Coordinates of C-alpha atoms in Angstrom, one line a residue:
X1 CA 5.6 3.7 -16.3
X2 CA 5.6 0.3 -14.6
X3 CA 1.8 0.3 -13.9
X4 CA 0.4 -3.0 -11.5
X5 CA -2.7 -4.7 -13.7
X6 CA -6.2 -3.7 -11.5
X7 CA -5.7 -7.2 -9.7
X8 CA -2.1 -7.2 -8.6
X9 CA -2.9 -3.2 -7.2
X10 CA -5.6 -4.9 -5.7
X11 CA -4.0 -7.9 -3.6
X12 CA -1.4 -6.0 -2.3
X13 CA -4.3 -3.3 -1.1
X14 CA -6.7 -5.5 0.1
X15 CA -3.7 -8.0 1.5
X16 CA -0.7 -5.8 2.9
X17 CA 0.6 -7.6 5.5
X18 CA 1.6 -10.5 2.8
X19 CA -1.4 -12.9 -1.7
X20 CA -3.2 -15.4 0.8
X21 CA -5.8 -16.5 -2.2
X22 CA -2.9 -17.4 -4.4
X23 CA -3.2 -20.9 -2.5
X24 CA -4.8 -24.2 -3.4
X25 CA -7.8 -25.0 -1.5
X26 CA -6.3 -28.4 0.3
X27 CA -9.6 -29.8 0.5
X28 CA -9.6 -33.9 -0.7
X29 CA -10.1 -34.4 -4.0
X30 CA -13.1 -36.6 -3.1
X31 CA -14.5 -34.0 -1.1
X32 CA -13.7 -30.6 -3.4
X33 CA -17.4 -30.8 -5.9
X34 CA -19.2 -30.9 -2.0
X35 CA -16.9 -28.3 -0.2
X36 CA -16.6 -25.8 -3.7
X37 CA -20.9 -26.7 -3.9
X38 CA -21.0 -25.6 -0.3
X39 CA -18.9 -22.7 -1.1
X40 CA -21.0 -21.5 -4.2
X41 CA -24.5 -21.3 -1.5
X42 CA -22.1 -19.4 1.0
X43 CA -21.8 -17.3 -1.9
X44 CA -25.8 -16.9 -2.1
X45 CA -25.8 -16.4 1.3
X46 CA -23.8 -13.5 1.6
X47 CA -25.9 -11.6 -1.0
X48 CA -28.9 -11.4 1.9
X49 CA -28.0 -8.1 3.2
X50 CA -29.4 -9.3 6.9
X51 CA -27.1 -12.0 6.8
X52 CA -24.2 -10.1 5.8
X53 CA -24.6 -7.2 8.4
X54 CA -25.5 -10.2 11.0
X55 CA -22.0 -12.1 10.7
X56 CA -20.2 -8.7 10.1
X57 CA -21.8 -7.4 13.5
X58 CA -21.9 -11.1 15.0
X59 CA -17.7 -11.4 14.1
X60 CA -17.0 -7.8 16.0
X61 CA -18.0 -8.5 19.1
X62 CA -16.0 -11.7 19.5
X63 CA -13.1 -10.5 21.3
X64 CA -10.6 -12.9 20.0
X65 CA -12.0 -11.2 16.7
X66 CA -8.9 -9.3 16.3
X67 CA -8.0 -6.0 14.2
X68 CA -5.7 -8.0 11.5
X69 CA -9.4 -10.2 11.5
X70 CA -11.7 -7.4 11.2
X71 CA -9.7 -5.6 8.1
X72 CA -8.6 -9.6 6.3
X73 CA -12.4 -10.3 6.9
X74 CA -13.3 -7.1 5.1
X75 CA -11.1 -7.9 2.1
X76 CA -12.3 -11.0 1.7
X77 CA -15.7 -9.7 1.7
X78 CA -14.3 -7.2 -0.9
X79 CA -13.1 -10.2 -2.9
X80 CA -16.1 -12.3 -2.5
X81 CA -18.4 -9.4 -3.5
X82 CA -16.3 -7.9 -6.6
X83 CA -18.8 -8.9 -9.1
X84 CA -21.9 -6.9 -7.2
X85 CA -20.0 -3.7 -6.4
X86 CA -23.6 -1.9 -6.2
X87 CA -24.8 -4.3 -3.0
X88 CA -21.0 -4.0 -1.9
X89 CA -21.7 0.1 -1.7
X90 CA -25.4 -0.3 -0.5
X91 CA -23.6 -2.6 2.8
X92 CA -21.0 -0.1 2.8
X93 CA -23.7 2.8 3.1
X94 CA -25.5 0.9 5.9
X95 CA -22.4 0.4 8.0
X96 CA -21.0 4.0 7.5
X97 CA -24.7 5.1 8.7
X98 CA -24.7 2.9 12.0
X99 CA -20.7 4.3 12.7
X100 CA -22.3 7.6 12.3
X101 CA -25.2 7.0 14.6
X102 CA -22.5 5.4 17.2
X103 CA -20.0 7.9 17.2
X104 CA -22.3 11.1 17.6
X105 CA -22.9 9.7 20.7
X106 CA -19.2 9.3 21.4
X107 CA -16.7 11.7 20.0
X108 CA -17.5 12.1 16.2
X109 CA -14.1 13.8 15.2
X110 CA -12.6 10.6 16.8
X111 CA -14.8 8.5 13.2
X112 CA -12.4 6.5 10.7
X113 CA -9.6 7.1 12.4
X114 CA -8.2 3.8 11.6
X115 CA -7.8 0.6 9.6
X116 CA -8.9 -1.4 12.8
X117 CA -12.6 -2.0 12.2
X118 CA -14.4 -3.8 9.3
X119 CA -15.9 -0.9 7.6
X120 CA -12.5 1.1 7.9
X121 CA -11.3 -1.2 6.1
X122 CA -14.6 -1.5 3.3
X123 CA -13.7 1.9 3.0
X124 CA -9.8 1.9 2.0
X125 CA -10.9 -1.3 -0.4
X126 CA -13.6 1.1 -2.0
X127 CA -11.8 4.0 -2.6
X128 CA -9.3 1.4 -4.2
X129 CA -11.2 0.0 -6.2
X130 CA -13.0 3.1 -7.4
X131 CA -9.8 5.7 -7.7
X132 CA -7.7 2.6 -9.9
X133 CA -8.3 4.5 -13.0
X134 CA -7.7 8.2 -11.8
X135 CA -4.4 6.8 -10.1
X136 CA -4.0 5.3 -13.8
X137 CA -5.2 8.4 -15.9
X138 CA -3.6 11.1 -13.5
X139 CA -1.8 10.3 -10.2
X140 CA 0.4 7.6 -11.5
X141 CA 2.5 10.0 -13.4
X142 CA 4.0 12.5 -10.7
X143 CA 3.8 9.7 -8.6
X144 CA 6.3 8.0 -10.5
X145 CA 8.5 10.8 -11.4
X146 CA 8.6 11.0 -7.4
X147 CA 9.8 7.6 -7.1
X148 CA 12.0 7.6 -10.0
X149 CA 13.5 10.9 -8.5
X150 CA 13.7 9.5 -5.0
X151 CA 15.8 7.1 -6.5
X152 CA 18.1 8.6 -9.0
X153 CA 19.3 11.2 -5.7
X154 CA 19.3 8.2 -3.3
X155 CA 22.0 6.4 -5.7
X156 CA 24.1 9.2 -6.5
X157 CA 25.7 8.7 -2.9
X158 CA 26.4 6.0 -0.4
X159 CA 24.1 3.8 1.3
X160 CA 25.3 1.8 4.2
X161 CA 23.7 -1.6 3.3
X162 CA 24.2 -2.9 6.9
X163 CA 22.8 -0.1 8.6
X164 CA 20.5 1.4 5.9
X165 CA 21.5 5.0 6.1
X166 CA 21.9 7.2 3.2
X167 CA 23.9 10.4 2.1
X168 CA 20.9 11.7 0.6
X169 CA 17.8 11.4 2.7
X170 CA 14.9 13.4 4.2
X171 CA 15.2 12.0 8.1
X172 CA 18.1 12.9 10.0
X173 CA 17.9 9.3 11.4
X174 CA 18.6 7.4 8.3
X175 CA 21.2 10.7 7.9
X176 CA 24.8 9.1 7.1
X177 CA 26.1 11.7 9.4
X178 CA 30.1 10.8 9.2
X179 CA 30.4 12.4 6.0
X180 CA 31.9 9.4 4.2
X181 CA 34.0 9.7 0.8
X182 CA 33.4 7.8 -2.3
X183 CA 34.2 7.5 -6.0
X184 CA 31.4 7.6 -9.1
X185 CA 32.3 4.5 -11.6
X186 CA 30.5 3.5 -14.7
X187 CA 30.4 0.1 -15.1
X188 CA 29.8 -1.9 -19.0
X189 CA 27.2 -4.1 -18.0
X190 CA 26.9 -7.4 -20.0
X191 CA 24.1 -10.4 -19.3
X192 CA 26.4 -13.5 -19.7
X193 CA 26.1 -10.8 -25.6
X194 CA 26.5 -7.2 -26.1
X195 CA 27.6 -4.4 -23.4
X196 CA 25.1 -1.4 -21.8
X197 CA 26.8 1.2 -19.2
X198 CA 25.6 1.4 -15.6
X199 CA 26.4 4.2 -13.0
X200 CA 27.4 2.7 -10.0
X201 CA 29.5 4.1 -6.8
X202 CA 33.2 2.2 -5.6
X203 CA 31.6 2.3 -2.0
X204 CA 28.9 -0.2 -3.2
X205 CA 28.5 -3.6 -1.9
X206 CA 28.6 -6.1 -4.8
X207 CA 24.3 -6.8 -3.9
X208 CA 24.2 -2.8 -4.3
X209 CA 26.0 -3.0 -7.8
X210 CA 24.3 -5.9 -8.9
X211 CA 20.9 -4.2 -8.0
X212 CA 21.9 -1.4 -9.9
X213 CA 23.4 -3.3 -13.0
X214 CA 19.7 -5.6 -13.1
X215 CA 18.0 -2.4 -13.6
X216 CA 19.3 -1.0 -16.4
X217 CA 20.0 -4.5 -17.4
X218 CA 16.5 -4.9 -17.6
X219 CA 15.2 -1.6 -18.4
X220 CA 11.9 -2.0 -19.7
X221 CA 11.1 -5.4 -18.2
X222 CA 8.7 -6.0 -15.3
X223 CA 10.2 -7.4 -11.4
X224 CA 7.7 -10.4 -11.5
X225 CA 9.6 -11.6 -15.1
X226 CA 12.9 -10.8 -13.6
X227 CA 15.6 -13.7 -12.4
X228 CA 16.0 -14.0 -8.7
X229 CA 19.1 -11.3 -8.1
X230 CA 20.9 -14.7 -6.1
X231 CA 20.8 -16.8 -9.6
X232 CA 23.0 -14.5 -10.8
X233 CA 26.9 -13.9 -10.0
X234 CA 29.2 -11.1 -10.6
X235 CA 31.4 -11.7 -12.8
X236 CA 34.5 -8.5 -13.7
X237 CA 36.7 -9.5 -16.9
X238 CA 39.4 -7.3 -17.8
X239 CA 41.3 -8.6 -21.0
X240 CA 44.5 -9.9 -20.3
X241 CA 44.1 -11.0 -16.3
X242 CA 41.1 -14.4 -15.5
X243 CA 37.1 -13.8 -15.1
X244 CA 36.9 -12.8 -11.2
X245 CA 33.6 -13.5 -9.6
X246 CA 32.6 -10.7 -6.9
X247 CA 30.5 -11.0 -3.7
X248 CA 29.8 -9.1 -0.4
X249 CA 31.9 -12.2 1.3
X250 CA 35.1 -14.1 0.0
X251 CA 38.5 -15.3 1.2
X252 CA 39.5 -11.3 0.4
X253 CA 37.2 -9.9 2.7
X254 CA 38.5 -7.1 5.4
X255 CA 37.9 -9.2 9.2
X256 CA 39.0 -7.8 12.2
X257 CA 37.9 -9.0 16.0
X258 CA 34.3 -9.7 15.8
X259 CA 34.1 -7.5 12.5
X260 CA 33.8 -7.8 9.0
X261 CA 33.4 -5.9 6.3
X262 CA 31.4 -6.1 3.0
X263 CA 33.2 -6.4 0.1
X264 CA 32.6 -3.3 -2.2
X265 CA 33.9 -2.2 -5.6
X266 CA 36.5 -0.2 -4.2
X267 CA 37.5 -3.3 -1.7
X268 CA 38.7 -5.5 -5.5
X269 CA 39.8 -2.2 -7.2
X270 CA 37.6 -2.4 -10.0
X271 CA 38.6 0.5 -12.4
X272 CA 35.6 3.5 -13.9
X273 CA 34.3 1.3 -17.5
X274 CA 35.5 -1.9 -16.6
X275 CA 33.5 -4.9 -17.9
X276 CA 31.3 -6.7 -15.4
X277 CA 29.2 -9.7 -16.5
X278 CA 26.0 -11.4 -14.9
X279 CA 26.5 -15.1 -14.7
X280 CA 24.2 -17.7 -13.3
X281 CA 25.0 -19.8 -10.3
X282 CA 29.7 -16.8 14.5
X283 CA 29.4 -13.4 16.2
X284 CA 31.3 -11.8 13.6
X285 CA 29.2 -8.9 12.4
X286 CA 29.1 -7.2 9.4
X287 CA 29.7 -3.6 8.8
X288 CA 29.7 -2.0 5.1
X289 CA 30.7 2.0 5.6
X290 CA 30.3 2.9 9.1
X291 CA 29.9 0.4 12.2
X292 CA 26.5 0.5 13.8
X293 CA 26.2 2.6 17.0
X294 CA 20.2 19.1 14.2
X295 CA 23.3 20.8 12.7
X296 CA 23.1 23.5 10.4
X297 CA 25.3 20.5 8.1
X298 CA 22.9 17.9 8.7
X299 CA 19.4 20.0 8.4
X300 CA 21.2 22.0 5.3
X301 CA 21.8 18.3 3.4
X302 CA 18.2 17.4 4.0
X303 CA 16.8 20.4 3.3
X304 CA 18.9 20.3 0.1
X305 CA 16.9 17.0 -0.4
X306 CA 13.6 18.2 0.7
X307 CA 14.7 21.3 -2.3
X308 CA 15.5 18.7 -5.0
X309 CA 12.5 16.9 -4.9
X310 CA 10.0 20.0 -4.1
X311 CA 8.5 20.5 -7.8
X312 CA 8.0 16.1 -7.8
X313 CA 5.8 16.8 -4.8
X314 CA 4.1 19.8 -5.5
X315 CA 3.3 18.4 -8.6
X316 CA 1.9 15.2 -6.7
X317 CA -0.1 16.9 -3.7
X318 CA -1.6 19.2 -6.8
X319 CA -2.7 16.8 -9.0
X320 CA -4.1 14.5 -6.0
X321 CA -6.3 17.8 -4.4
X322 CA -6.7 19.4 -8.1
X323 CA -9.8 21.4 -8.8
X324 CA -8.9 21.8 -12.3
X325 CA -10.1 18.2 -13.1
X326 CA -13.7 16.1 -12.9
X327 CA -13.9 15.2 -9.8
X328 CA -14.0 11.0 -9.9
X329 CA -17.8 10.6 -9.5
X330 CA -17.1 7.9 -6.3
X331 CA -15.5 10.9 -4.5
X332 CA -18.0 13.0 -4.9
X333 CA -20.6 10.3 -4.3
X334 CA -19.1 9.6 -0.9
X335 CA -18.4 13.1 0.1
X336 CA -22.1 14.2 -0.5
X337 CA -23.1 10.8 1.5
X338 CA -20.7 12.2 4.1
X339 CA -22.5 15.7 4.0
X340 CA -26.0 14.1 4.2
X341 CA -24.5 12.1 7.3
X342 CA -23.8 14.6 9.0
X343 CA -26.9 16.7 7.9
X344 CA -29.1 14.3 9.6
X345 CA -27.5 14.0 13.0
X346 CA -27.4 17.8 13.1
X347 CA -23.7 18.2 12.8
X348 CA -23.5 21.2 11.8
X349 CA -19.4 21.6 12.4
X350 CA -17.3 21.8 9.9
X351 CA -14.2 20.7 11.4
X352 CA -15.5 17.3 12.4
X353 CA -16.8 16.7 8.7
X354 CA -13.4 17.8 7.5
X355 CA -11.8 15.2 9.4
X356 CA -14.2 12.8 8.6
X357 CA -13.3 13.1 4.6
X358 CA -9.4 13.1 5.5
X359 CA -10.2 10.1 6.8
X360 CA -12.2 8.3 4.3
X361 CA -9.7 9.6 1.4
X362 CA -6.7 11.2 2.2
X363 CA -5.5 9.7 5.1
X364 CA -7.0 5.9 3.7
X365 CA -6.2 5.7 -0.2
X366 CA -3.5 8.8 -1.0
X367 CA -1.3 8.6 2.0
X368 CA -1.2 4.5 1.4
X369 CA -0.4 5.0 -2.2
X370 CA 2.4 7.5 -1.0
X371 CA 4.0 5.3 1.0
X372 CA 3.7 2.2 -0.1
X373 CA 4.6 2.6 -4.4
X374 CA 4.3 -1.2 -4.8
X375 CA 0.6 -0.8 -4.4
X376 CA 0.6 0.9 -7.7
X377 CA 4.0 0.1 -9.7
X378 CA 6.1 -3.1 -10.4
X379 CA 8.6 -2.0 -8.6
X380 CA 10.7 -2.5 -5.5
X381 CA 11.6 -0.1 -2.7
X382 CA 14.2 0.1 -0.2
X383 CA 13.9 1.3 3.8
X384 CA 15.7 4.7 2.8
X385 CA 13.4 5.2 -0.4
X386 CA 10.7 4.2 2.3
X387 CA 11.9 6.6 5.3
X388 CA 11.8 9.4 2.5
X389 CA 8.2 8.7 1.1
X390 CA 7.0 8.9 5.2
X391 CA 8.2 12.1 5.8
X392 CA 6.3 13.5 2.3
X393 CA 3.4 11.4 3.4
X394 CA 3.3 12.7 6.7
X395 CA 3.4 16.4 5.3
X396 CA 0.1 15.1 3.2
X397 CA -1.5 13.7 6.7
X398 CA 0.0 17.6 8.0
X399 CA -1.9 18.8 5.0
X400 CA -5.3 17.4 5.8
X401 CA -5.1 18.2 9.6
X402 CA -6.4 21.3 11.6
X403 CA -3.9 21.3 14.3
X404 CA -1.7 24.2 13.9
X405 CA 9.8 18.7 16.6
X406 CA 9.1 15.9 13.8
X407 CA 11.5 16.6 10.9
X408 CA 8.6 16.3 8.2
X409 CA 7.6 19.7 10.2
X410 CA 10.7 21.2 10.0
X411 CA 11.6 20.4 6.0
X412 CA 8.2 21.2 5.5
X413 CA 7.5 24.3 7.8
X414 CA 7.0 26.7 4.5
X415 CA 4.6 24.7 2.7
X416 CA 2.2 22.7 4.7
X417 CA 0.1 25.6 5.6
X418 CA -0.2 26.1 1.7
X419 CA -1.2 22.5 1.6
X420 CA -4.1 22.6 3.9
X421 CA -5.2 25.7 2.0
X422 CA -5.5 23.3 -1.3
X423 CA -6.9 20.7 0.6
X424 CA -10.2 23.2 2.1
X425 CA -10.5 24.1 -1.6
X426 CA -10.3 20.4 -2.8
X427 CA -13.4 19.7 0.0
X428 CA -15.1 22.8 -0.9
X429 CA -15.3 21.8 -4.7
X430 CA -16.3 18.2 -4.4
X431 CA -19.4 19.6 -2.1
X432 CA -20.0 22.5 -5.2
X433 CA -19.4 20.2 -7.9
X434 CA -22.7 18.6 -9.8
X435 CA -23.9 15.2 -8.1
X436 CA -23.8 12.2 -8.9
X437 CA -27.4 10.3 -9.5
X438 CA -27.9 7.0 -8.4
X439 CA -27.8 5.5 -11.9
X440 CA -24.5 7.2 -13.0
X441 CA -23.1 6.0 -9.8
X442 CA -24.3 2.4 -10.1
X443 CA -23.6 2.2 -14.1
X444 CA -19.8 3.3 -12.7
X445 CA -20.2 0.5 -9.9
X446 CA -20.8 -2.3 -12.3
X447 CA -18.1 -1.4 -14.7
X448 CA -15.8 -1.4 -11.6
X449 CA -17.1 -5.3 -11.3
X450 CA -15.3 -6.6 -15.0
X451 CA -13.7 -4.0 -16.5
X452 CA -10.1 -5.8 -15.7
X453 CA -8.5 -9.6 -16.2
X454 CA -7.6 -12.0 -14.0
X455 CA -9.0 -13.8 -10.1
X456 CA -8.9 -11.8 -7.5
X457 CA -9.5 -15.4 -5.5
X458 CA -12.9 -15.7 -4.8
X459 CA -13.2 -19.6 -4.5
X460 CA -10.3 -19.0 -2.0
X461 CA -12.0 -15.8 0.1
X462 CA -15.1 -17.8 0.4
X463 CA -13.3 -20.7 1.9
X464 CA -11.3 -18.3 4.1
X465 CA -14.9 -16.8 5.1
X466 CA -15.4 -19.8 6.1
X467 CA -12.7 -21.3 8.0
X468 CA -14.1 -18.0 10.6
X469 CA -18.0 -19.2 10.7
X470 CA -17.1 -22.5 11.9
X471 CA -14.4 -20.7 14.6
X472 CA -17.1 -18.8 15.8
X473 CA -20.3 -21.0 14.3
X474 CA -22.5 -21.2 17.7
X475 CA -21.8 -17.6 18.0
X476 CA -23.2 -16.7 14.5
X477 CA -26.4 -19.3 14.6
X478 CA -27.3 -18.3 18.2
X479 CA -27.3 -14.3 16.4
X480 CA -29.8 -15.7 13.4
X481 CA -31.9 -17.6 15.7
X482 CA -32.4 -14.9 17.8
X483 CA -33.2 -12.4 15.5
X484 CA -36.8 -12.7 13.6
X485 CA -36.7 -12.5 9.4
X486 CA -33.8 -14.4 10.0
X487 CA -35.6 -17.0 11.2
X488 CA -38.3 -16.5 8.9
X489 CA -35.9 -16.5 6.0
X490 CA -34.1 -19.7 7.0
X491 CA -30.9 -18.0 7.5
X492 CA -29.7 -20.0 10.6
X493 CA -30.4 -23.4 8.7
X494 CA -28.5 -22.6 5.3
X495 CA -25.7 -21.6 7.1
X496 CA -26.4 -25.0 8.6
X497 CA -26.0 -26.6 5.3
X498 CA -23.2 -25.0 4.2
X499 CA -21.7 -26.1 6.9
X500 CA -22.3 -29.8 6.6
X501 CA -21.7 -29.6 2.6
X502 CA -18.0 -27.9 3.6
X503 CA -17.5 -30.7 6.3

């Protein structure tokens, strides 16, 4: 199992629209010591929990302050903050706690609803952090096996590399609906050297085959020490006849009017075991199988689909809500804070505290982690590998919801009410289950802060924090000054310096 070290998992958590630490700082080299000295009291300064929940606050109500700001603040706050996960929980604690004040007043079902806000986003980066290990020890398995099985159907037929649309598929949308026809081949795959087999289609593009021919190619090795797939060429040798490089484009290539085709296995007649090596290296559109524009047929073959891949995601969904397990001490810590919350604003409905834990966990961390397998694996995905993992992760989200039409709905019609049966179990043991003291939970927090290798790019963070106190500087120092320990504890001034150390 390709498992992502704690700090890759991490970046691509904390950073999904991208990593934007993996940068050098391009500060003068005769101004770095000063700027990275400045940076080391901005450090300081954002262990002063006043501070902190000052330019948090301060930051929110600037409304060019936008919600790609507000969750890439949070994560650098998450990165900045890494080593003292205990004070990153305590801030954590005291936002939730204010956002449960607030919404009371409002709608309180309405709570966490989505990655907009800085404390959603604390949240996703805190279950992250705290769940690596369970997703290690015991998710990461059937996860895998979903992804690997995903894959292995997926390959077995056509996919239209223009389009995107697949034989094998759980949306009707991404359905290759003209039922195309096709040949399997199995290729002997050589690294221009001896030969391993590959099971490809004819109705492949020569990107597809290569794609395919890479992996088992490099069965065991990791994408990151992989060669870029456009160093290498194709490269078919039968015996007697020359070396013939392939690709999707050449002088052979099928063209007519404004149209051309890809050029796939079938296109040069490449024959089931021949050898192919991998060597190094104007309004006309492409089309690969079918140009670019529910029947019992096309409901029966994704239903078929949704059947095939039914034990990988029972075995997922079960593992993820399991009461057969410890519960990981973090879930139980934040549920039981989530209880209290509601205990002491007199909520006394259970339906609006359900929603708030399918929004803290399931619909944050699990429903991420099923639709984005990159957080969690080396691996790469495709959009038809993607739509398929949405529909499952929508029948999770379906799962945690009350509400008793979208084709997750329809594939999943049988089973989702079985779902949300585990998932009022799943709630109702976590709330049974012994608590977790303060001592175990903050012995577990500090591990969390160095029990991994490698920067997660705090030098970086901190000069990324920065780069948004001088955008909005007056703003922050006018909120310190007015404000009273702030001014007794000089908060306004070492900001101040910090500023004139970092310019």
């Amino acid at each position: 199992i390709p498992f992502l070290d704690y700090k890759v998992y991490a970046e691509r958590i904390f950073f999904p629209g991208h990593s934007p630490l993996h940068r050098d700082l391009g500060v003068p080299e005769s101004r770095r010591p000063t700027v990275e000295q400045g940076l080391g009291q901005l450090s300081n300064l954002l262990n002063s929990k006043l501070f902190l929940t000052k330019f948090i606050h301060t930051l929110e109500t600037q409304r060019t302050f936008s919600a790609r700001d507000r969750a890439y603040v949070a994560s650098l706050l998450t990165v900045a903050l890494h080593g003292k996960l205990e004070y990153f929980t305590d801030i954590l604690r005291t936002l939730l706690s204010d956002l449960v004040a607030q919404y009371v007043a409002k709608n309180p079902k309405l709570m966490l609803r989505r990655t907009e806000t800085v404390v959603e986003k604390l949240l996703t980066n805190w279950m992250s952090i705290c769940l690596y290990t369970f997703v290690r020890d015991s998710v990461g398995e059937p996860l895998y096996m979903l992804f690997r099985g995903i894959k292995h159907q997926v390959d077995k037929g056509p996919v239209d590399s223009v389009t995107g649309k697949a034989k094998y598929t759980l949306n009707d949308n991404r359905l290759l609906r003209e039922d195309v026809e096709y040949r399997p081949l199995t290729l002997n795959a050589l690294l221009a050297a001896q030969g391993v087999p590959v099971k490809v289609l004819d109705c492949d593009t020569i990107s597809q085959a290569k794609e395919k021919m890479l992996d088992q190619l490099y069965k065991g090795v990791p994408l990151t020490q992989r060669p870029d797939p456009r160093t290498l060429d194709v490269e078919w040798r039968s015996g007697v006849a020359g070396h013939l490089i392939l690709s999707d484009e050449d002088v052979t290539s099928e063209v007519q009017g404004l149209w051309r085709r890809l050029n796939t296995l079938q296109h040069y007649k490449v024959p089931d075991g021949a050898t192919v090596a991998l060597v190094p290296c104007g309004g006309i559109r492409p089309w690969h199988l079918v140009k670019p524009s529910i029947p019992e047929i096309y409901l029966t073959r994704l239903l078929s689909m949704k059947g095939t891949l039914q034990k990988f995601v029972d075995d997922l969904f079960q593992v993820i809500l399991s009461t057969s397990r410890p519960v990981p001490l973090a879930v139980k810590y934040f549920f039981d804070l989530l209880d209290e919350q509601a205990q002491q604003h007199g909520i006394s409905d259970q339906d609006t505290i359900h929603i708030w834990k399918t929004n803290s966990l399931p619909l944050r961390f699990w429903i991420n982690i099923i639709k984005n397998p990159q957080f969690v694996f080396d691996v790469q995905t495709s959009d038809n590998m993607d739509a398929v993992l949405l529909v499952i992760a929508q029948t999770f989200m379906d799962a945690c919801t009350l509400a008793d039409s979208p084709i997750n709905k329809l594939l999943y019609a049988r089973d989702i009410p079985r779902y949300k049966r585990m998932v009022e179990r799943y709630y109702a043991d976590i709330r049974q289950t012994v608590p977790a003291s303060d001592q175990e939970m903050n012995s577990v927090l500090a591990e969390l802060s160095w029990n991994y290798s490698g920067d997660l790019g705090a030098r970086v963070a901190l000069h990324e924090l920065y780069k948004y106190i001088n955008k909005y500087y007056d703003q922050i120092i006018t909120a310190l000054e007015e404000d009273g320990t702030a001014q007794k504890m000089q908060l306004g001034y070492r900001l101040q310096q910090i500023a004139a150390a970092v310019e």
